[PDB]
């Protein structure tokens, strides 16, 4: 079920990421002012879906739910043991723990992929 893994550890939660993805659109697909409000709700849901998909594309992650990238992890963002992070901590806790650094990480992911694509075009 949707968010069934919300209290699960980060590692365990990743076992079924798909349920959180299919329900971003299936829940959309399944008085004048009332009509306008409903259109705003539907349009916004689409716009948010697309934003996230574009970011993954820009960062070099396409149809995968999990992508490794080539940006090094900074100990200045977070410096903790991987065993705790993946086995004894949940994603809700984790998101709260590193919510400061999302803007910088995203910028770095974008730059790395941009350089990679140029290098690949030259190497062909």
Ligand X SMILES: *[C@@H]1O[C@H](CO)[C@@H](O)[C@H](O)[C@H]1NC(C)=O
Evaluate whether 76 touches 101 at the Cβ level (below 8 Å).
no
Q: Answer yes or no whether residue 32 interacts with a copy of itself by CB under 8 A.
A: yes
Evaluate whether 81 touches 39 at the Cβ level (below 8 Å).
no
Nearer to ligand X, 38 or 84 (CB): 84
Q: Answer yes or no whether residue 88 interacts with a copy of itself by CB under 8 A.
A: no
Q: In the complex, what is the shortest distance from the CB of residue 18 to ligand X, in angstroms, rounded to a whole number?
A: 17
Binding site partner of 76, from ligand X, a copy of itself, none, Cβ cut-off 5-8 A by kind: ligand X
Q: Answer yes or no whether residue 35 interacts with a copy of itself by CB under 8 A.
A: yes
3-state secondary structure 75-114: CCCCCCCHHHHHHHCEHHHHHHHCHHHHHHHHHHHHHHHH
Binding site partner of 105, from ligand X, a copy of itself, none, Cβ cut-off 5-8 A by kind: a copy of itself
Q: In the complex, what is the shortest distance from the CB of residue 29 to a copy of itself, in angstroms, rounded to a whole number?
A: 5
10 Å Cβ neighbour count for 109?
20
């Amino acid at each position: 079920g949707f968010l069934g893994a919300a209290g699960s550890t980060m590692g365990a939660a990743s076992m079924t990421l798909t349920v959180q993805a299919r329900n971003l659109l299936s829940g959309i697909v399944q008085d004048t002012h009332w009509g306008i409000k409903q259109l705003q709700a539907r349009v916004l849901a689409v716009e948010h879906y697309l934003r996230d998909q574009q970011l993954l594309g820009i960062w070099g992650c396409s149809g995968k739910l999990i992508c490794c990238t080539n940006v090094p992890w900074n100990s200045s963002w977070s410096n903790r043991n991987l065993s705790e992070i993946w086995d004894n901590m949940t994603w809700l806790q984790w998101d709260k723990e590193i919510s400061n650094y999302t803007q910088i990480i995203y910028g770095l992911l974008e730059e790395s992929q941009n350089q990679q694509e140029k290098n690949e075009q030259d190497l062909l």
